[PDB]
C-alpha cells in the first residue's frame, strides 16, 4: 500500500493552498480517517487533522480537512509564513496507519536575495596537517535553495564536495557552507580553484589560488 | 502544557538492544492511545504499533514483530518501545505520539537512535582568517559523533554568528564551521577566539583567528 503526495508546493502569505493525498489502493474514503501532521526544523512535529477533517488542539482555523475527488486534502487559507514546513499525511486501512512521502510546502515570507559568497583557501595549519579544505560560505540569500559547483582551474570537481542544507540566518534569510576536500599536493598544483553558487537572481563565481 | 517527553538519544553497537521511553502529562494519560512512528533518513515515516494504556492491548506493523516491542505503564503515565537485534537499519528517529478517534493529537519530541561500531574521534580546529564588513570563522574537522558545539568570544560574540549544520562525509565523519560577520575596521584591534566543544570525546578547543 502506498500514499503519495505532491514532493513539494510553494505560496505566499495571504495565499490558499491545498495539499493532496493519494492512496494506491483507489478512493480516499472518510474511513481511512486522513490525518495531515507538520514537521517543522528540529523534529518538531504538530498534528493539523484527523477523524473525519477535525482540527487537533490549539491547530487554527485556517487549516482545514475535505475529500477532492478521489484523493483526501489539506486546505490552508491565508498562509502565513509560519505554514512552511513539511506536511505529512496518514491513511487507515482497517489494521495499521500509512503514511504519505510528505510535502514541502515553502512560504515566500521575504525578498529574494541572492548571496553573498567568501571562499577561504585551505590554512596553512592545515596544510601542515597534510590535508586541504576549501571553505565556500553562502551567505544572506532567499529563498533557501542554491547550486553550488566546483572548479580546479577551468573544470569541473564533484568528488570530495559536501554542502551544508541551507540553514535560517537570524534574520531569517538562508546561509550554506560548502566544502572540497583536496590533497595538498592538489591546491599547490593548479593555479585556483572556484566555487560558483547559482540563485535565481544571480550567478556568482569566486575564486582562491595557492599563492 | 500537554507534553510527550521522551528518553534521549541512543548511540549503541549492533546487536544491541534500547529502551525508549515517553512520559505524558498535562493530558488526561488514559484518555489517549500511544502510537510509535520511525523516520528514516529524516524523510520517511512509518508505523510501529499502538498501545492502549487502559488495557495493554496493541496492535502492531507486522514489518515491526519481533523488532519493537510496546509495554505501558499507568500509573506513571510512561509508554515504552524496545527494540532488540540492532542493525543499522534502525538508526532513525522514534516517535511517540497521542492518539484518540483515529486523530495524532500529540507529539514526542523524538529518539535519535545511532547504530554504529565506529569509534569517538575528537575534531580537528582550522581558522578561516579574514583577508564593510569581513567575515571569519573555525573549520572544525573530522569528528565521531555529533554533536559539536561552537561560540565565539567565551559567548561574548553573538551579532554576526552563524554555525552551520555539520555534514556527514564519505569517511563516516563529521565536519562543521562556524562564521562571523564583523567590521572591516575592527580587524587587527578585537579578539576574535571560537570555543569549540566536542563533548563525546571530552575535547576543547580555543582557536584565536587572526587576518
Known amino acids: 500500500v502506498v500514499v503519495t503526495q505532491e514532493s513539494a508546493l510553494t505560496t505566499s502569505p495571504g495565499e490558499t493552498v491545498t495539499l493532496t493525498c493519494r492512496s494506491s489502493?483507489?478512493?480516499?474514503?472518510?474511513?481511512?480517517?486522513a490525518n495531515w501532521v507538520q514537521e517543522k526544523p528540529d523534529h518538531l512535529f504538530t498534528g493539523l487533522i484527523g477523524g473525519i477533517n477535525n482540527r487537533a488542539p490549539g491547530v487554527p482555523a485556517r487549516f482545514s480537512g475535505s475529500l477532492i475527488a478521489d484523493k483526501a486534502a489539506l486546505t490552508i487559507t491565508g498562509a502565513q509564513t509560519e505554514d512552511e514546513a513539511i506536511y505529512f499525511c496518514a491513511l487507515w486501512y482497517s489494521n495499521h496507519w500509512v503514511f504519505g512521502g510528505g510535502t514541502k510546502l515553502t512560504v515566500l515570507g521575504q525578498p529574494k536575495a541572492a548571496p553573498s559568497v567568501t571562499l577561504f583557501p585551505p590554512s596553512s595549519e592545515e596544510l601542515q596537517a597534510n590535508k586541504a579544505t576549501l571553505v565556500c560560505l553562502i551567505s544572506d540569500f532567499y529563498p533557501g535553495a542554491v547550486t553550488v559547483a566546483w572548479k580546479a582551474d577551468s573544470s569541473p570537481v564533484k568528488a570530495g564536495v559536501e554542502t551544508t542544507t541551507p540553514s535560517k540566518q537570524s534574520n531569517n534569510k538562508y546561509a550554506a557552507s560548502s566544502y572540497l576536500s583536496l590533497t595538498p599536493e592538489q591546491w599547490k598544483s593548479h593555479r585556483s580553484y572556484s566555487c560558483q553558487v547559482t540563485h535565481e537572481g544571480s550567478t556568482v563565481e569566486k575564486t582562491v589560488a595557492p599563492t | 502544557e500537554v507534553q510527550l517527553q521522551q528518553s534521549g538519544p541512543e548511540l549503541v553497537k549492533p546487536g544491541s538492544s534500547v529502551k525508549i521511553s515517553c512520559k505524558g502529562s498535562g493530558y488526561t494519560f488514559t484518555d489517549y492511545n500511544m502510537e510509535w512512528v520511525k523516520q528514516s533518513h529524516g524523510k520517511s515515516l512509518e508505523w510501529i504499533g499502538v498501545?492502549?494504556?487502559?488495557?495493554?492491548?496493541?496492535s502492531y506493523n507486522q514489518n515491526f514483530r519481533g523488532k519493537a516491542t510496546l509495554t505501558v505503564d499507568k500509573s506513571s503515565s510512561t509508554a515504552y518501545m524496545d527494540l532488540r537485534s540492532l542493525t543499522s537499519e534502525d538508526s532513525a528517529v522514534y516517535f511517540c505520539?497521542?492518539?484518540?478517534?483515529?486523530?495524532?493529537?500529540?507529539w514526542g519530541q523524538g529518539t535519535t537512535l545511532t547504530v554504529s561500531s565506529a569509534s569517538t574521534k575528537g575534531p580537528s580546529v582550522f581558522p578561516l582568517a579574514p583577508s564593510g564588513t569581513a567575515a571569519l570563522g573555525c573549520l572544525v574537522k573530522d569528528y565521531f559523533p555529533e554533536p559539536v558545539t561552537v561560540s565565539w568570544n567565551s559567548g561574548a560574540l553573538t551579532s554576526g554568528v552563524h554555525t552551520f549544520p555539520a555534514v556527514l562525509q564519505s569517511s563516516g565523519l563529521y565536519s562543521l564551521s562556524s562564521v562571523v560577520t564583523v567590521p572591516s575596521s575592527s580587524l587587527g584591534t578585537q579578539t576574535y577566539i571560537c570555543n569549540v566543544n566536542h563533548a563525546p570525546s571530552n575535547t576543547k578547543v580555543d582557536k584565536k583567528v587572526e587576518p
Open positions: 489502493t483507489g478512493a480516499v474514503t472518510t474511513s481511512n480517517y
Open positions: 505520539a497521542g492518539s484518540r478517534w483515529y486523530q495524532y493529537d500529540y
Open positions: 498501545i492502549n494504556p487502559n488495557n495493554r492491548f496493541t
